[PDB]
């Protein structure tokens, strides 16, 4: 009284679920006996035959697996899988037999269940046999010519021999079936139709992989591989062709847990208990080259897919790869993108920055944000933009940590905007020019340092980044910024709990100010002439405050703040 | 580690022998543990058992237990990569004999260095177990005394629930040293308070008295004797015993995750004992035991005294009590009593909502909080402004748990909650005022629609004459059920950190409703001027920044901080005479 007849959709199903079963209880009997001499003593053979039988309405799907027990017949056998053979049947018989037990029968109508023992005794030796006493719609299953198909479509990555009962013009078996590995086969006899066919085999339904890679790998250790990266956000291991595991979690590193595929050693031990041969030294080899082979897989991917595909499903895999993966970082350092000043959207690799750089340029200049907007904006990167140089624009948490592990790309230091090292060369003449300018502003210097933000400011200068704004916060190169701040501050509150003792953490910063700009020559202009004045005071004090959250700090105090504003639109207001 | 582990426990070397009991001890309850589900696991030695001879003769101390021991594969993993290598803290050379089920008896000789297994000439000596032999040091050579270790097993191995003898003189025959009776099987009353802390320092180390313990016998549906303790600090679980045999300390389902730093004891004469794990961990009394401990734990909790309370352990757990509030419907009420907050009566002491309460006015309904980032924030905001003029209390919520946590108590005591940033605040009005208040509506009128229909269109939801500000000219108010800016900013956050932008939301991106106040000076002359010339640009700007600053205040994002600078550059330049 559930599905029968809705999923039906897909009507024929049934089959391969049985014949998926059937097949990993051929696996499991096979892993077993690489420990136990015994395990093989009812069947030699390890097959699946299907029996076609019109009079009695039958339909048997027999295996030479693990076979059963009585107490696992009762609650493995219940509620696609195992179910799915009720969508053809009224009725399942499952015989069937395992070595630690006697061999027993199991009986549903897809509402009750009964164990009864077997009055024939031990007819299997081992394995199990699937009878199905069919439906009269679904009936057209006990046909010879269409079960034959039947078999050749849903078990085309069966590594296990299959047969049909028929005969030729003498009933026997017949091989459906070729159990020779997709990935043992050469690379090039394999179409690119079977690739995506074998990833929908074991990912379970769905549409294409994103990339594949298929691969002999030599040297050292020798082993086969098909590796594969999904469409959106497991590693099978066989030795010698008989599958052991796809419970060892850690084939891959964590940053590349996506990756799916296939991995078939020869040079690894086949009889040795399974937690001995995840620690077994060849092991390692195996992994530190399944990465690079995944690396040239991803590198492998078209410009445009990479991009508008790849990037925007693992970049921050690949970030996490660049923090987490030393001996490929310069590797992984390739395969970032960031969006940079270079276009409004678009993302760029740090080589294609690299060949954009200015003959003269020594650094990577990068912004770091929560917003394309916020970091764009800033007064930072006034002068750079207005002179021709790329600025790298981080918007993400793990940019900045990102860019961290990155000591040098390509022989080039990144320098961040928002602290001191910007730098900006001139000549002989050109030097002496900022030097006047330098110390007529000296004055407005020493009266902001020493009582306009006296203590709060760490020293001001005059600026040599900015264009438009007046003025902004810098922050030492051994300091944090204003980003870094907001990473740093939002998880010390949110997990942290109290962090304020820290030395270059909450510290006053360098107060750069912009020669050219009318506030800052009136501000110097009337410093001149009284010095006293609460009005240029408050006019410095509110620039400071406004430059703070301009700069991306908080507000020490909001209060304070409003009330300055308030003051001056008191000003602005009465004449 | 390496030679510089003797150095650094100088002070502490006859703890060597805790360390080979505790391992003794580990080794019978696995043996114990296995002979649950295998009839014959025991058919090698019978008994479970720890003996101890003095063999001054041949410079031998002798630790020979009757538990799991060790496999040929096992000692060259387990013996070498606190812990075993204490008993070089006193011996030089350190061999251990012995015999586990599956295998047969090898002797381990090492000294630090390498190490070398050989198959024991002798043969098949204890059945079963271990016997740890020390080559007792010169400079340590006084354990191999028949009354050394007699005091000192009495003093380390208490809380050692099998049987531990030594050979003593008298005709030479095993002595017992301890009881097996567990401290849990013993009658409250009886067991000394030394005994509970020395307990807890036993089974978790950290050598300093627990914070709280709790010490109780269940009776009804399901019977069961427990010792729980909260620990001294937030570590930055809970031992199971059926009929007094270990079974494990595996199960991470004791005890619901807000009460995960609670460590203990529990020893149930009701559930299964002769089965499987797997089959235990789903049985239902478990849910039965489950549910008693939480409410013990919570009645422990409770028997702290009030100055300890808020001092040390509300530091220390309150976050668990608040997320507690929001996963535990059942004990809600319980929790809720415990919870401490920040509030206007005090600049540092923190409140619970018992003491709040006795504090409300005598028609005063709702229990007023503030949230945001600190407390400054929190206690400089304009919202509080009225409230605490006229002398109501305002909670102070700083953490970001604690609106969620607010958000799902929705009353405490009969009195509902309400966020001073939000539509809902009331003030008790003498006809006086009310009247007062009407007047200045009208008046007001002109300003309010002119910032609502051109000023500030499309910025605000409507534009009022405020009751709640007093230093302040205006604060963005939020709808009933919509966002704060507290909300706004945790939402952001989290949208960030870990969510993929939340831009397009659902109410992050609404207008507020802008409240201003009428007696506040910039409003006075705001209200003049816009009669006399609405189509005023110097007002119409002013408007704009003090909406924008009113943003800041109000704790919401400001939406373009570079338009914003240059609006306020702008006023600079008009108000000096750039
Ligand atoms: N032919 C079989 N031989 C042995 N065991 C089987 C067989 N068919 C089903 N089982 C057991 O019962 C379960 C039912 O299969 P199914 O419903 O498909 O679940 P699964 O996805 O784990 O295979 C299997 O996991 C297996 O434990
Ligand atoms: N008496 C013993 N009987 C059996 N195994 C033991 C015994 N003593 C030590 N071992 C083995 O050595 C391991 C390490 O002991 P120790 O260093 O104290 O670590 P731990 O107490 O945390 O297990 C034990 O876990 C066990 O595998
Ligand atoms: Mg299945
Ligand atoms: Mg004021
Ligand atoms: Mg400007």
Same mark, same amino acid.
Request: net charge neutral.
């Given at each position: 009284?559930?599905?029968?007849?809705?999923?039906?959709?897909?009507?024929?199903?049934?089959?391969?679920?049985?014949?998926?079963?059937?097949?990993?209880?051929?696996?499991?009997?096979?892993?077993?006996?690489?420990?136990?001499?015994?395990?093989?003593?009812?069947?030699?053979?390890?097959?699946?035959?299907?029996?076609?039988?019109?009079?009695?309405?039958?339909?048997?799907?027999?295996?030479?697996?693990?076979? %059963?027990?009585?107490?696992?017949?009762?609650?493995?056998?219940?509620?696609?899988?195992?179910?799915?053979?009720?969508?053809?049947?009224?009725?399942?018989?499952?015989?069937?037999?395992?070595?630690?037990?006697?061999?027993?029968?199991?009986?549903?109508?897809?509402?009750?269940?009964?164990?009864?023992?077997?009055?024939?005794?031990?007819?299997?030796?081992?394995?199990?046999?699937?009878?199905?006493?069919?439906?009269?719609?679904?009936?057209?299953?006990?046909?010879?010519?269409?079960?034959?198909?039947?078999?050749?479509?849903?078990?085309?990555?069966?590594?296990?021999?299959?047969?049909?009962?028929?005969?030729?013009?003498?009933?026997?078996?017949?091989?459906?079936?070729?159990?020779?590995?997709?990935?043992?086969?050469?690379?090039?006899?394999?179409?690119?139709?079977?690739? +995506?066919?074998?990833?929908?085999?074991?990912?379970?339904?769905?549409?294409?992989?994103?990339?594949?890679?298929?691969?002999?790998?030599?040297?050292?250790?020798?082993?086969?591989?098909?590796?594969?990266?999904?469409?959106?956000?497991?590693?099978?291991?066989?030795?010698?062709?008989?599958?052991?595991?796809?419970?060892?979690?850690?084939?891959?590193?964590?940053?590349?847990?996506?990756? +799916?595929?296939?991995?078939?050693?020869?040079?690894?031990?086949?009889?040795?208990?399974?937690?001995?041969?995840?620690?077994?030294?060849?092991?390692?080899?195996?992994?530190?080259?399944?990465?690079?082979?995944?690396?040239?897989?991803?590198?492998?991917?078209?410009?445009?897919?990479?991009?508008?595909?790849?990037?925007?499903?693992?970049?921050?895999?690949?970030?996490?790869?660049?923090?987490?993966?030393?001996?490929?970082?310069?590797?992984?350092?390739?395969?970032?993108?960031?969006?940079?000043?270079?276009?409004?959207?678009?993302?760029?690799?740090?080589?294609?920055?690299?060949?954009?750089?200015?003959?003269?340029?020594?650094?990577?200049?990068?912004?770091?944000?929560?917003?394309?907007?916020?970091?764009?904006?800033?007064?930072?990167?006034?002068?750079?933009?207005?002179?021709?140089?790329?600025?790298?624009?981080?918007?993400?948490?793990?940019?900045?940590?990102?860019?961290?592990?990155?000591?040098?790309?390509?022989? +080039?230091?990144?320098?961040?905007?928002?602290?001191?090292?910007?730098?900006?060369?001139?000549?002989?003449?050109?030097?002496?020019?900022?030097?006047?300018?330098?110390?007529?502003?000296?004055?407005?210097?020493?009266?902001?340092?020493?009582?306009?933000?006296?203590?709060?400011?760490?020293?001001?200068?005059?600026?040599?980044?900015?264009?438009?704004?007046?003025?902004?916060?810098?922050?030492?190169?051994?300091?944090?910024?204003?980003?870094?701040?907001?990473?740093?501050?939002?998880?010390?509150?949110?997990?942290?709990?109290?962090?304020?003792?820290?030395?270059?953490?909450?510290?006053?910063?360098?107060?750069?100010?912009?020669?050219?700009?009318?506030?800052?020559?009136?501000?110097?202009?009337?410093?001149?002439?009284?010095?006293?004045?609460?009005?240029?005071?408050?006019?410095?004090?509110?620039?400071?405050?406004?430059?703070?959250?301009?700069?991306?700090?908080?507000?020490?105090?909001?209060?304070?703040?409003?009330?300055?504003?308030?003051? %001056?639109?008191?000003?602005?207001?009465?004449?």
């Amino acid at each position: 009284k559930l599905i029968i007849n809705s999923l039906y959709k897909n009507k024929e199903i049934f089959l391969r679920e049985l014949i998926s079963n059937a097949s990993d209880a051929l696996d499991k009997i096979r892993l077993i006996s690489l420990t136990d001499e015994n395990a093989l003593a009812g069947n030699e053979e390890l097959t699946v035959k299907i029996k076609c039988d019109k009079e009695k309405n039958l339909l048997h799907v027999t295996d030479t697996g693990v076979g %059963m027990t009585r107490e696992e017949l009762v609650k493995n056998l219940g509620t696609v899988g195992f179910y799915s053979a009720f969508l053809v049947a009224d009725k399942v018989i499952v015989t069937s037999k395992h070595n630690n037990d006697t061999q027993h029968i199991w009986e549903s109508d897809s509402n009750e269940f009964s164990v009864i023992a077997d009055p024939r005794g031990n007819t299997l030796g081992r394995g199990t046999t699937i009878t199905l006493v069919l439906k009269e719609e679904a009936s057209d299953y006990l046909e010879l010519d269409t079960i034959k198909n039947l078999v050749k479509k849903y078990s085309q990555f069966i590594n296990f021999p299959i047969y049909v009962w028929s005969s030729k013009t003498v009933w026997d078996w017949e091989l459906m079936n070729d159990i020779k590995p997709i990935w043992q086969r050469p690379s090039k006899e394999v179409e690119d139709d079977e690739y +995506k066919a074998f990833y929908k085999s074991f990912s379970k339904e769905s549409d294409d992989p994103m990339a594949y890679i298929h691969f002999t790998a030599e040297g050292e250790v020798t082993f086969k591989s098909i590796l594969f990266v999904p469409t959106s956000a497991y590693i099978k291991l066989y030795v010698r062709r008989v599958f052991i595991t796809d419970d060892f979690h850690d084939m891959m590193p964590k940053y590349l847990n996506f990756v +799916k595929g296939v991995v078939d050693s020869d040079d690894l031990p086949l009889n040795v208990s399974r937690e001995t041969l995840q620690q077994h030294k060849l092991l390692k080899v195996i992994r530190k080259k399944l990465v690079r082979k995944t690396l040239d897989m991803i590198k492998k991917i078209a410009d445009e897919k990479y991009n508008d595909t790849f990037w925007k499903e693992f970049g921050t895999n690949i970030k996490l790869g660049v923090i987490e993966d030393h001996s490929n970082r310069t590797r992984l350092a390739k395969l970032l993108r960031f969006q940079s000043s270079h276009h409004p959207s678009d993302i760029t690799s740090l080589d294609q920055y690299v060949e954009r750089m200015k003959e003269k340029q020594d650094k990577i200049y990068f912004m770091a944000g929560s917003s394309r907007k916020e970091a764009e904006s800033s007064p930072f990167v006034e002068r750079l933009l207005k002179k021709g140089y790329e600025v790298i624009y981080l918007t993400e948490p793990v940019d900045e940590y990102c860019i961290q592990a990155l000591p040098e790309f390509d022989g +080039k230091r990144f320098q961040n905007v928002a602290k001191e090292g910007v730098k900006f060369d001139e000549s002989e003449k050109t030097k002496e020019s900022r030097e006047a300018i330098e110390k007529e502003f000296e004055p407005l210097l020493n009266w902001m340092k020493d009582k306009a933000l006296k203590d709060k400011i760490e020293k001001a200068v005059v600026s040599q980044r900015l264009t438009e704004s007046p003025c902004a916060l810098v922050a030492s190169q051994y300091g944090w910024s204003g980003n870094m701040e907001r990473i740093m501050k939002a998880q010390a509150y949110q997990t942290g709990k109290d962090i304020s003792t820290n030395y270059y953490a909450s510290q006053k910063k360098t107060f750069e100010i912009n020669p050219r700009h009318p506030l800052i020559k009136d501000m110097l202009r009337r410093v001149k002439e009284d010095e006293d004045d609460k009005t240029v005071s408050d006019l410095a004090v509110v620039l400071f405050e406004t430059a703070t959250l301009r700069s991306g700090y908080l507000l020490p105090d909001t209060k304070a703040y409003g009330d300055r504003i308030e003051r %001056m639109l008191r000003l602005s207001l009465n004449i």
